[PDB]
Amino acid sequence: LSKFGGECSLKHNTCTYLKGGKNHVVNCGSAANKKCKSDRHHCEYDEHHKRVDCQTPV
Ligand SMILES: [Zn+2]
Numbered sequence: 001l002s003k004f005g006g007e008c009s010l011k012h013n014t015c016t017y018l019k020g021g022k023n024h025v026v027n028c029g030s031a032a033n034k035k036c037k038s039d040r041h042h043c044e045y046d047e048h049h050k051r052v053d054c055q056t057p058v
Contacts, residue, residue: 001019002046002047002048003044003045003046003047003048004017004018004019004024004044004045004047005017005018005042005043005044006018006023006042006043006044006045007040007041007042007043008028008036008038008039008040008041008042008043008054009036009039009040010036010037010038010039010040010041011039012036013027013028013030013035013036013054014026014027014028014036015027015028015036015043015044015045015052015054017043017044017045019047024045026045026052027052028043028052028054029052029054033055034052034053034054034055035054035055036054036055037054037055041054041055042056042057044056
């Protein structure tokens with residue numbers, strides 16, 4: 001698997017995702033369409049393309 005799901009922190013602006021059954025962290029990004037806008041919202045990290053999305057529900 002190279003796309004990982006998790007939850008974003010509104011205060012820290014980060015995506016905490018599961019990889020190999022353990023929590024890992026990446027920053028969401030600072031732009032209006034990238035940052036975490038709702039606490040504990042779903043996020044996805046695509047490790048293959050090095051892209052994170054802290055705003056799409058799917
Ligand atoms: Zn490729």
